[model samples]
Target: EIIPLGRLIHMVNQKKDRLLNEYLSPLDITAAQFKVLCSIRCAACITPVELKKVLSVDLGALTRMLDRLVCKGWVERLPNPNDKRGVLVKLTTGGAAICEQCHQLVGQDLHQELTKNLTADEVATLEYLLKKVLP
Candidate 1:
């Protein structure tokens, strides 16, 4: 039987998002928000222009997300010392703590749930194949 690779990949992505949303619900963060938080953690501090590129999101959408995060006191906007007009996005202490908790949850329980049916070898092969196929 032929595998519908694209369809399967899309479905898998949707399922992963659903699972992530559920797992992160207790932290009062959605899957999308968690992604932004992780991106910020990776960069230490970043500008919205760079963040939009990193998240592949439009400025309007990114701004709304940032607003919500800032409202929650998880993120703060500060002047970019090097850029006159641009601002830097930095995680607050509360943001850092939640990000760490989310990271641990994803690395452990989420990873297990996602790979529950796959063997260790299959998991490695899956990772290799996905990375190999990316542009």
Candidate 2:
């Protein structure tokens, strides 16, 4: 008997998001939004064009995601002095604060909890396989 690889991958992602969302509930962000905050923090400031490339999401999806972050007062759009036609993405004081907390929380033990059932070598093997499967 065998399971579909695509189905198994989808279930893994679903559970991971559920666990991450629970951990992030108090922080007022979703697993999806957390990636955006992390990227924006890494960039300090970035254009949407660049962010879209980094995230591999379409521009419209990026726009909607940014809009929610702006509504939450965690991000702001500013005119790019170097480029009159484009704007830059920057984290707000609140966003940076929450992002810091979120990063710490996830870094501390989330992965450990996720892989609690796996042996050290199993975890390493899983990581290697996942990397190989990535585009």
Candidate 3:
């Protein structure tokens, strides 16, 4: 019998969040904050509009996260040279280095744990299901 997908997904999501948080704690960043870090890393000074697509969080939450990143000197917000009405954020050198570390933790550590109990085929199936669920 299949377990309730809603409950199972919720539980898995919570555990995943906790695991990511613990892994990122040494860097003083949470999973939510890491979303912003990765987004900025992928873009060269991402505008808020572009950033919103990566982070589903509302503007208030995004503002608070960016404020924290700024305080940590991980990101700098500058007036957009292309648009006077908007601003852009870029990762500092220190932030880029930290993101590399985050990559190791996420790519190797988290991935190892996530796949340890599953076979190659199962992993593929899991990935397919996950992508299918994305809205």
Candidate 4:
């Protein structure tokens, strides 16, 4: 019988968490924090509301995470030039450096892990299938 989708999802999530924890250890970042950094990098200038929508994170939790990032000198908050009431979040040089390093480590780890079980063509096909399934 085929595995339940929920069980497959759980397995994937667990594997991701384990790999992320190991890969990010050198940069002292958790996967959650890395996710925030990545969102900012991709969006260029992200506001609290934007982050909430993009990350599916609540305001309170996101605020705390932002506070930690600010304290770490990895992100800076700026008043939105177009909207004085809104604030924008951007990655600092330190944040970019750490993100880059962590990304490299994670990418390498993923490559090694995936290649162990799947051929290059299989990996590509899997990626295509997932993309097609994604909303």
**Model 3 C-alpha lDDT per residue in residues 1-135, reported as the tens digit of each score:** 689989999888878777888888877778988878899998888987789877777987788878889888899988998898899999999889888888776766777676789998999999999899997
Best by lDDT: 1
* Local accuracy of candidate 2 as per-residue lDDT tens digits, 38-100: 899999899999999998888998899999999999999999999978999999999999999
- CA lDDT scores, all candidates in order: 0.91, 0.90, 0.85, 0.87
lDDT of 1: 0.91
lDDT tens string, model 1, 1-135? 676989889989889989999888877789999999999989889998999998988899999999999998889999999997899999999999989998777667778899999999999999999999998
lDDT value, candidate 4, whole model: 0.87
Each candidate's TM vs. the true structure? 0.88, 0.77, 0.80, 0.87
Query: Considering lDDT, where higher is better, how would the candidates rank from best to worst?
Result: 1, 2, 4, 3
Winner on lDDT between 1 and 2 is: 1
Give lDDT: candidate 2, residue 116. Answer: 93
Error of 2 at 92 (Å): 1.8
Candidate 4 residue lDDT tens string, 6-104 = 798688877877778778888888888998999998887899889999988889999999999999999999999999999999999998988888888
Regions of model 2 farther than 4 Å from truth? 1-11, 128-135
Model 4 TM: 0.87
Position 48, candidate 4: lDDT: 83
